[PDB]
Amino acid sequence: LFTGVVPILVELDGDVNGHKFSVSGEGEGDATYGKLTLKFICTTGKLPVPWPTLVTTLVQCFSRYPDHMKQHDFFKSAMPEGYVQERTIFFKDDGNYKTRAEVKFEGDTLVNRIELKGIDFKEDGNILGHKLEYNYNSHNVYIMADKQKNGIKVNFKIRHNIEDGSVQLADHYQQNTPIGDGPVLLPDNHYLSTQCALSKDPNEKRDHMVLLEFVTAAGI
Numbered sequence: 001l002f003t004g005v006v007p008i009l010v011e012l013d014g015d016v017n018g019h020k021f022s023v024s025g026e027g028e029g030d031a032t033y034g035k036l037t038l039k040f041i042c043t044t045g046k047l048p049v050p051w052p053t054l055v056t057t058l059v060q061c062f063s064r065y066p067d068h069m070k071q072h073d074f075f076k077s078a079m080p081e082g083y084v085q086e087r088t089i090f091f092k093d094d095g096n097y098k099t100r101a102e103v104k105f106e107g108d109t110l111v112n113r114i115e116l117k118g119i120d121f122k123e124d125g126n127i128l129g130h131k132l133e134y135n136y137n138s139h140n141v142y143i144m145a146d147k148q149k150n151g152i153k154v155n156f157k158i159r160h161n162i163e164d165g166s167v168q169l170a171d172h173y174q175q176n177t178p179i180g181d182g183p184v185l186l187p188d189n190h191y192l193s194t195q196c197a198l199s200k201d202p203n204e205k206r207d208h209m210v211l212l213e214f215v216t217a218a219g220i
Contacts, residue, residue, distance in 0.1 A: 001079055002031035002061065007109040008038060010058050016097070016118035017128060019048035025058055027211075029110070031076070034064025034216045042207035049118070050132035051209045052160050055196055056089070056172060057099050058211070059112050060141075063192050065217040072187035072220060074143075074152050074176065080105035081180020083151075092169040095121035104179060126160070126168045133161040136196035140218075145186035151177035152187065190219035 010025030027038030040051075040058060047054075061075035075083070082104025089097040101114040121128045137159050146153040154174035159167045178184045195214040 001105070002076055005030045006062075008036070008059065008062075009106075009109050009111045010038065010040065011111070011113040012054075012058060012116060013114065014116040014118075016049055016116070017095070017121050017123070020044065021048055023047070023054070023058070029059060029062035031062050032064060034062070034214055036062050036211070036213040036215075038211045038213075039201065040209040040211065041204075045207070047207045049127050050130050050160075051134065051198065052132050052136055053091075053097075053127055053170070054116075054209075055136060055198075055211065056158065056170075057087070057097070057101070057114060057116060059103055059110065060192065060215070061103065061110070063215040063217050069190070069217055069220055071185060072190060072217070074145075074185055074187055075103075077185040078176075078178040078180070079110075081178060081182065083176050083178050086175050088173040090171040090173075091121075091125075091127060092171070094125040094127055094168075095119055102179065126162055131163050132168065133163060134198055134200075135161060136198055137161070138193065138195045141192040141194055142189070143187060143191060144189050146175065147186060149175065149177055150184070150186070151175060188220060190217060192217050 005028045012023035014021045022044045025040040029036040065073045085101040087099045097118040103112045141156045144153045158170045199210040
């Protein structure tokens with residue numbers, strides 16, 4: 001199902017400190033290569049948070065699993081019924097985000113529809129004050145099978161660089177469960193080496209983000 005370059009659609013309904021926003025994205029993902037190229041637009045006006053804080057929220061089934069690791073690919077085995085991705089993201093000494101997402105095949109397109117809710121941000125923090133650098137670092141995303149939940153458990157910490165040269169951590173808690181009843185693959189502990197590059201389309205007027213990403217499953 002992921003043999004070539006597949007069409008991707010991203011739908012985000014957000015509310016951070018009551019500031020509501022919607023974000024729509026489209027693009028393509030190539031699983032064998034381990035690549036994604038997407039563009040995101042804020043369709044409600046100015047985006048109330050920094051773009052980097054939303055990169056993890058806005059489809060790990062596009063990860064490249066080397067041939068000797070096909071057995072451990074939960075994201076793809078759960079397709080096309082898909083899976084529900086849930087998270088709790090904690091910003092060191094600032095607010096948090098709780099997200100619920102369904103990543104599934106709608107006909108020929110892979111769709112990621114998300115609900116995001118963030119509370120407790122300092123109306124002057126690094127987030128609501130926009131003090132984050134418009135960039136992104138590499139991270140390892142840790143996976144553990146979660147037999148009790150016929151799903152997987154994911155953990156990782158994101159380093160967001162702050163203008164002043166310091167770092168703003170965002171501790172991520174994640175779980176993934178199949179939507180359909182067929183048997184999916186429960187993997188052995190491994191990780192995904194993720195890389196993110198953010199740019200801007202000089203011709204775009206709306207609030208937006210151009211994202212290209214490189215992910216390869218490792219540790220096994």
